[PDB]
Design a protein around this ligand. Structure first.
Ligand SMILES: COc1ccc(NC(=O)N2CCN(C(=O)c3sccc3F)C[C@H]2C)cc1
Length: 119
């Protein structure tokens, strides 16, 4: 029932993600001058380095917030990708699956910890 355990769990999961080849397209922010169209499609840029930075700054209060930003990475790349005949989209789907399979217990454990605390 450790209310704070999620943070190290999320750090370790981001480490796994960064080690994963599938994360390559998503590790750093997009350059808007390099990707002309991104401006008009993505309303909120997000990448894994920003997520890790936010976590390490102490600017996430819950793993749910971290989860929302990670899911934004995946919806952003979906919005911009105009075809499945793309190494990027297939990479997003696989990395998303991996992320969700690992983040599920992190969320569960945090929410039970908060419930226990307010018991
Ligand atoms: C053949 O050479 C290529 C080299 C690279 C690329 N990459 C792309 O097309 N990407 C990168 C992933 N996309 C993203 O939305 C995000 S989300 C956080 C980071 C990020 F980059 C979509 C799009 C901008 C394409 C072709």
């Amino acid at each position: 029932y450790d209310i704070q355990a999620w943070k190290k769990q999320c750090e370790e999961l981001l480490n796994l993600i960064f080690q994963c080849e599938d994360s390559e397209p998503f590790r750093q922010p997009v350059d808007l001058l390099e990707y002309p169209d991104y401006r008009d499609i993505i309303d909120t840029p997000m990448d894994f380095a920003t997520v890790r930075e936010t976590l390490e700054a102490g600017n996430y209060e819950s793993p749910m917030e971290l989860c929302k930003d990670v899911r934004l990475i995946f919806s952003n790349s979906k919005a911009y990708t105009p075809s499945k005949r793309s190494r990027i989209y297939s990479m997003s789907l696989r990395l998303s699956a991996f992320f969700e399979e690992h983040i599920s217990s992190v969320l569960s454990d945090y929410k039970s910890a908060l419930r226990f605390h307010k018991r």
